[PDB]
Amino acid sequence: TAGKIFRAMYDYMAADADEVSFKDGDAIINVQAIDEGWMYGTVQRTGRTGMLPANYVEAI
């Protein structure tokens, strides 16, 4: 029942207040998903919500 969840694999560095800073090993959820472009979830490491590069995080 809605248990896809995701996971990051790199230490992305937010460029502004629109992205997030998740590191490899941290987990995240999925409030949105533009696909073929960027993503959106709440950093479980702190709770900030922003965009994420699909070329960094992946599913598990």
Short mmCIF file of N, CA, C and O in Angstrom, two decimals:
data_model
loop_
_atom_site.label_atom_id
_atom_site.label_comp_id
_atom_site.label_asym_id
_atom_site.label_seq_id
_atom_site.Cartn_x
_atom_site.Cartn_y
_atom_site.Cartn_z
N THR A 1 0.86 -1.22 0.00
CA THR A 1 0.00 0.00 0.00
C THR A 1 0.88 1.25 0.00
O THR A 1 1.23 1.78 1.04
N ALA A 2 1.24 1.74 -1.16
CA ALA A 2 2.10 2.96 -1.22
C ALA A 2 3.38 2.74 -0.40
O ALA A 2 3.58 3.36 0.62
N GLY A 3 4.24 1.87 -0.85
CA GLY A 3 5.50 1.62 -0.09
C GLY A 3 6.68 1.64 -1.06
O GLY A 3 7.71 1.04 -0.81
N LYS A 4 6.54 2.31 -2.17
CA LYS A 4 7.66 2.37 -3.15
C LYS A 4 8.90 3.00 -2.51
O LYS A 4 9.97 2.44 -2.52
N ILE A 5 8.74 4.17 -1.94
CA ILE A 5 9.89 4.86 -1.29
C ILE A 5 11.06 5.00 -2.28
O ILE A 5 11.06 4.43 -3.35
N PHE A 6 12.06 5.77 -1.92
CA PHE A 6 13.22 5.95 -2.84
C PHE A 6 14.52 6.01 -2.03
O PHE A 6 14.55 5.67 -0.87
N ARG A 7 15.59 6.44 -2.64
CA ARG A 7 16.88 6.52 -1.90
C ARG A 7 17.92 7.29 -2.72
O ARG A 7 17.99 7.17 -3.92
N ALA A 8 18.73 8.08 -2.06
CA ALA A 8 19.77 8.85 -2.80
C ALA A 8 21.07 8.06 -2.86
O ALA A 8 21.27 7.11 -2.12
N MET A 9 21.96 8.42 -3.74
CA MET A 9 23.25 7.68 -3.85
C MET A 9 24.43 8.66 -3.99
O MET A 9 25.55 8.25 -4.22
N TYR A 10 24.19 9.93 -3.86
CA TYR A 10 25.30 10.91 -4.00
C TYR A 10 25.10 12.09 -3.04
O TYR A 10 24.03 12.27 -2.48
N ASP A 11 26.10 12.90 -2.85
CA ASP A 11 25.96 14.07 -1.94
C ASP A 11 25.61 15.32 -2.76
O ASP A 11 26.43 16.18 -2.98
N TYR A 12 24.39 15.40 -3.23
CA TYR A 12 23.99 16.59 -4.05
C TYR A 12 24.10 17.87 -3.23
O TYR A 12 23.90 17.88 -2.03
N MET A 13 24.41 18.96 -3.88
CA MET A 13 24.53 20.26 -3.16
C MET A 13 23.45 21.21 -3.67
O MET A 13 23.52 21.72 -4.77
N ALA A 14 22.44 21.47 -2.88
CA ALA A 14 21.35 22.38 -3.32
C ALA A 14 21.93 23.68 -3.89
O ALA A 14 22.78 24.31 -3.29
N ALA A 15 21.49 24.08 -5.05
CA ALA A 15 22.01 25.34 -5.66
C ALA A 15 21.31 26.55 -5.04
O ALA A 15 21.88 27.61 -4.89
N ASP A 16 20.07 26.39 -4.66
CA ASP A 16 19.32 27.52 -4.04
C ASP A 16 18.32 26.98 -3.03
O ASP A 16 18.48 25.90 -2.50
N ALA A 17 17.28 27.72 -2.75
CA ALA A 17 16.26 27.23 -1.77
C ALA A 17 15.17 26.44 -2.49
O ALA A 17 14.08 26.25 -1.97
N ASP A 18 15.43 25.98 -3.68
CA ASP A 18 14.40 25.21 -4.43
C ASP A 18 14.75 23.72 -4.45
O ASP A 18 13.90 22.88 -4.65
N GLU A 19 16.00 23.38 -4.26
CA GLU A 19 16.38 21.94 -4.28
C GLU A 19 16.59 21.44 -2.86
O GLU A 19 16.28 22.11 -1.90
N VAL A 20 17.15 20.27 -2.73
CA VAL A 20 17.41 19.72 -1.37
C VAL A 20 18.85 19.20 -1.29
O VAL A 20 19.54 19.10 -2.29
N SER A 21 19.32 18.88 -0.12
CA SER A 21 20.72 18.38 0.00
C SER A 21 20.74 16.98 0.63
O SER A 21 21.09 16.82 1.78
N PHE A 22 20.39 15.97 -0.12
CA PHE A 22 20.41 14.59 0.44
C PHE A 22 21.74 13.92 0.12
O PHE A 22 22.37 14.20 -0.88
N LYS A 23 22.20 13.04 0.98
CA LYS A 23 23.51 12.37 0.73
C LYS A 23 23.30 10.89 0.41
O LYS A 23 22.22 10.35 0.57
N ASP A 24 24.33 10.22 -0.03
CA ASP A 24 24.21 8.77 -0.35
C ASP A 24 23.91 7.97 0.92
O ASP A 24 24.66 8.01 1.88
N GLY A 25 22.83 7.24 0.93
CA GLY A 25 22.49 6.44 2.14
C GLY A 25 21.23 7.00 2.79
O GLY A 25 20.51 6.31 3.49
N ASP A 26 20.95 8.26 2.56
CA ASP A 26 19.73 8.87 3.17
C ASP A 26 18.48 8.39 2.43
O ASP A 26 18.53 8.01 1.27
N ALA A 27 17.35 8.40 3.08
CA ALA A 27 16.10 7.94 2.42
C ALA A 27 15.17 9.13 2.17
O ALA A 27 15.29 10.17 2.78
N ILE A 28 14.24 8.97 1.27
CA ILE A 28 13.29 10.08 0.97
C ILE A 28 11.92 9.51 0.57
O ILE A 28 11.78 8.32 0.36
N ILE A 29 10.92 10.34 0.47
CA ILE A 29 9.57 9.83 0.08
C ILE A 29 9.28 10.25 -1.38
O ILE A 29 10.13 10.12 -2.24
N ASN A 30 8.10 10.73 -1.68
CA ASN A 30 7.80 11.13 -3.09
C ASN A 30 6.49 11.91 -3.16
O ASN A 30 5.46 11.38 -3.53
N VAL A 31 6.51 13.17 -2.82
CA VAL A 31 5.27 13.98 -2.87
C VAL A 31 4.94 14.34 -4.33
O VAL A 31 3.79 14.56 -4.68
N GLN A 32 5.93 14.39 -5.17
CA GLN A 32 5.67 14.72 -6.61
C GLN A 32 6.67 13.99 -7.51
O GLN A 32 7.52 13.26 -7.04
N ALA A 33 6.56 14.17 -8.80
CA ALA A 33 7.50 13.48 -9.73
C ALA A 33 7.31 14.00 -11.16
O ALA A 33 6.36 13.64 -11.83
N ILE A 34 8.20 14.83 -11.62
CA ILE A 34 8.07 15.36 -13.01
C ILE A 34 8.58 14.34 -14.03
O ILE A 34 8.26 14.39 -15.19
N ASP A 35 9.38 13.40 -13.59
CA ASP A 35 9.92 12.36 -14.52
C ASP A 35 10.74 13.02 -15.64
O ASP A 35 10.55 14.17 -15.96
N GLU A 36 11.65 12.27 -16.22
CA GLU A 36 12.52 12.81 -17.33
C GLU A 36 12.92 14.27 -17.07
O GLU A 36 12.97 15.07 -17.98
N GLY A 37 13.21 14.61 -15.85
CA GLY A 37 13.60 16.02 -15.55
C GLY A 37 14.02 16.14 -14.08
O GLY A 37 15.19 16.11 -13.76
N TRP A 38 13.08 16.29 -13.18
CA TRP A 38 13.45 16.43 -11.74
C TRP A 38 12.43 15.68 -10.87
O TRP A 38 11.47 15.13 -11.35
N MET A 39 12.65 15.67 -9.58
CA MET A 39 11.70 14.95 -8.67
C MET A 39 11.31 15.86 -7.50
O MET A 39 11.57 17.05 -7.51
N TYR A 40 10.70 15.31 -6.49
CA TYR A 40 10.30 16.13 -5.31
C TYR A 40 9.96 15.23 -4.12
O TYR A 40 9.13 14.34 -4.23
N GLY A 41 10.58 15.45 -3.00
CA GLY A 41 10.29 14.60 -1.81
C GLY A 41 10.74 15.32 -0.54
O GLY A 41 11.33 16.39 -0.60
N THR A 42 10.48 14.76 0.60
CA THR A 42 10.89 15.41 1.88
C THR A 42 12.15 14.74 2.43
O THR A 42 12.14 13.57 2.77
N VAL A 43 13.23 15.46 2.52
CA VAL A 43 14.49 14.86 3.06
C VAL A 43 14.24 14.27 4.44
O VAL A 43 14.07 14.98 5.41
N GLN A 44 14.21 12.97 4.55
CA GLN A 44 13.96 12.33 5.87
C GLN A 44 15.10 12.67 6.85
O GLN A 44 14.97 12.48 8.04
N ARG A 45 16.20 13.16 6.35
CA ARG A 45 17.33 13.51 7.26
C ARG A 45 17.02 14.78 8.05
O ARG A 45 17.55 15.00 9.12
N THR A 46 16.16 15.61 7.54
CA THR A 46 15.81 16.87 8.26
C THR A 46 14.31 17.16 8.15
O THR A 46 13.65 17.46 9.12
N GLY A 47 13.78 17.07 6.96
CA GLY A 47 12.32 17.34 6.78
C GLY A 47 12.11 18.45 5.74
O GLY A 47 11.01 18.91 5.54
N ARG A 48 13.15 18.88 5.08
CA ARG A 48 12.99 19.95 4.05
C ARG A 48 12.45 19.36 2.75
O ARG A 48 12.83 18.28 2.34
N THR A 49 11.57 20.07 2.09
CA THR A 49 11.01 19.55 0.81
C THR A 49 11.53 20.37 -0.37
O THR A 49 11.46 21.59 -0.36
N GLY A 50 12.05 19.73 -1.38
CA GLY A 50 12.57 20.48 -2.55
C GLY A 50 12.64 19.56 -3.77
O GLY A 50 12.06 18.50 -3.80
N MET A 51 13.36 19.98 -4.78
CA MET A 51 13.47 19.14 -6.02
C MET A 51 14.74 18.28 -5.97
O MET A 51 15.69 18.58 -5.27
N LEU A 52 14.76 17.21 -6.73
CA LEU A 52 15.96 16.31 -6.75
C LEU A 52 16.27 15.89 -8.19
O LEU A 52 15.37 15.63 -8.96
N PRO A 53 17.54 15.81 -8.51
CA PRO A 53 17.95 15.40 -9.87
C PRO A 53 17.73 13.89 -10.05
O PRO A 53 18.28 13.08 -9.33
N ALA A 54 16.93 13.51 -11.01
CA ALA A 54 16.67 12.06 -11.25
C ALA A 54 17.96 11.31 -11.57
O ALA A 54 18.04 10.11 -11.45
N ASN A 55 18.98 12.02 -11.99
CA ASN A 55 20.27 11.34 -12.33
C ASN A 55 21.08 11.05 -11.06
O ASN A 55 22.20 10.58 -11.12
N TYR A 56 20.53 11.34 -9.91
CA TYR A 56 21.28 11.08 -8.64
C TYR A 56 20.54 10.05 -7.79
O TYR A 56 21.04 8.98 -7.51
N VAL A 57 19.34 10.37 -7.38
CA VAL A 57 18.56 9.42 -6.54
C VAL A 57 17.93 8.33 -7.41
O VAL A 57 17.79 8.48 -8.61
N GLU A 58 17.55 7.23 -6.82
CA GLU A 58 16.93 6.13 -7.61
C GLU A 58 15.94 5.36 -6.74
O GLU A 58 15.74 5.66 -5.58
N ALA A 59 15.30 4.36 -7.29
CA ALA A 59 14.31 3.58 -6.49
C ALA A 59 14.99 2.35 -5.87
O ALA A 59 16.12 2.04 -6.17
N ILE A 60 14.30 1.65 -5.01
CA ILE A 60 14.90 0.44 -4.38
C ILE A 60 13.81 -0.60 -4.10
O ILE A 60 13.82 -1.16 -3.01
#
